[PDB]
């Protein structure tokens, strides 16, 4: 698994990898690891599938209640703190690591990384899932604060594809979710659209097209 969140001038561009595995078998190739909490806040689910899914459901429920009570678009900070309410409340049972991103008139686009165990860390970007480790070195020399929706999109695609190419637990299509003042924009990048990194070849239908 891989989940990355990038903050650009206007908002967030949360990301994912799409591969729920049960051992060495790939039970699902197009899992959706980014879920909605409100129209402006999304969480990158990672870790245990059941635990992350239900924490997403419960946060969405509490956050519906909250946004009706206030009659007002719920903020990112509150979404992250609600995710922590359950991540920390259930340290024993929930083996989940998540990244929460969104947009507000109050504070703009913010990313809150709730790692395993239940801390909240506002960050310029976050990395999670088992595929994170292949990225620390790359991101540290890549992150430039204040990017556009474009450069941030390319960087998220590069990060998730580099993690995909090298990690057993991460693969499939790259999914990204651009959250902004105008609203969420969900994308889908199969392997064919992603670049080709060290010692990888261009996909070809059949060897009969080259011979050997």
């Amino acid at each position: 698994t891989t989940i990355i969140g990038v903050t650009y001038k206007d908002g967030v561009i949360l990301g994912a990898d799409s591969r729920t595995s049960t051992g060495v078998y790939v039970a699902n190739r197009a899992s959706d690891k980014i879920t909605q909490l409100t129209d402006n806040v999304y969480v990158c689910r990672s870790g245990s599938a059941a635990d992350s899914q239900i924490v997403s459901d419960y946060v969405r429920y509490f956050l519906h209640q909250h946004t009706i009570q206030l009659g007002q678009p719920a903020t990112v900070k509150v979404a992250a703190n609600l995710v922590r309410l359950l991540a920390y409340g259930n340290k024993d049972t929930l083996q989940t690591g998540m990244i929460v991103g969104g947009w507000d008139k109050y504070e703009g686009g913010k990313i809150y990384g709730i790692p395993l165990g239940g801390t909240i860390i506002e960050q310029p970007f976050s990395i999670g899932g088992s595929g994170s480790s292949y990225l620390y070195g790359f991101l540290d020399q890549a992150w430039k604060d204040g990017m556009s929706k474009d450069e941030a999109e390319e960087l998220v695609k590069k990060a998730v594809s580099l993690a995909i190419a090298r990690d057993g637990a991460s693969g499939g299509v790259v999914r990204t979710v651009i959250i902004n003042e105008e609203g969420v924009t969900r994308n889908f990048y199969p392997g064919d659209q992603l670049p080709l990194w060290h010692e990888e070849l261009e996909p070809q239908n059949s060897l009969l097209d080259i011979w050997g």
């Binding site: 459901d57 429920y61 519906h64 209640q65 009706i68 009570q69 009659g71």
Partner: protein, 238 residues
């Protein structure tokens, strides 16, 4: 005996406390009406501030139970807020537990069932609030419903609540004898007009509040005072 004081059957079979709750609704001076159209549902009531001090935006009887459900509460304001909190808790719980938006008829039925409880348990005074629920059912089209302190939810094509029940009903069914199919603008203007014909006075589009739904825009919405004023002008010139 005690039956005048608590919700137990009177010697002739009436529950007097529920009746007194109805009287409490008709108290308070306010009256409200709703008109279900072909394409929309409009719900309208009158609000009035006696003081310069009281902020006018803090007083209103339209409540957004859900982005796609509304509710107009007639009765005691505190009870109206209690019932509103209960319904908001139910709507969110229904969507959570069952995975889809709660339909209007379900909200009305749940409110009515909750109200029935006060009517059977002796030491729980029935809520003195008649609540009108509007929403556009995803499959049944526009909906309108009315729940009373007794607990008799029934679905109404058009209805009234408050101190002027009968006058509003008579005007509405006079204007609706033909079983019409009201356009949006026609629906909302019929509601406003039936309020006018009950108050016997004009109103500056400020002492009135309107809430509407539309199939083209299911969100329960409260009209801008300028839209209310445009509807007033349209009523004037015909």
């Amino acid at each position: 005996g005690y039956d005048r004081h608590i919700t137990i059957f009177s010697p002739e079979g009436r529950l007097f406390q529920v009746e007194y709750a109805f009287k409490a609704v008709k108290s308070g001076g306010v009256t409200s009406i709703a008109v279900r159209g072909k394409d929309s549902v409009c719900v309208v009531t009158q609000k009035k501030v006696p003081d310069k001090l009281l902020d006018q935006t803090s007083v209103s009887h339209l409540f957004k139970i859900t982005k796609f459900l509304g509710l107009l509460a007639t009765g005691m304001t505190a009870d109206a807020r209690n019932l509103v909190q209960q319904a908001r808790n139910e709507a969110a719980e229904f969507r959570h537990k069952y995975g889809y938006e709660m339909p209007v008829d379900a909200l009305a039925r749940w409110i009515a069932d909750k109200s029935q409880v006060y009517t059977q348990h002796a030491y729980m005074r029935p809520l003195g609030v008649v609540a009108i629920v509007i929403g556009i059912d995803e499959e049944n089209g526009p909906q309108l419903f009315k729940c009373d302190p007794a607990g008799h939810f029934y679905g109404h094509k058009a209805t009234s609540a408050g101190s002027k029940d009968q006058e509003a009903i008579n005007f509405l069914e006079k204007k609706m004898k033909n079983d019409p199919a009201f356009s949006y603008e026609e629906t909302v203007q019929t509601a406003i007009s039936a309020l006018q014909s009950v108050l016997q006075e004009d109103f500056k589009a400020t002492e009135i509040e309107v809430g509407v739904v539309q199939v083209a825009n299911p969100v329960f919405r409260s009209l801008t005072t300028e839209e209310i004023d445009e509807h007033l002008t349209a009523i004037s010139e015909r």
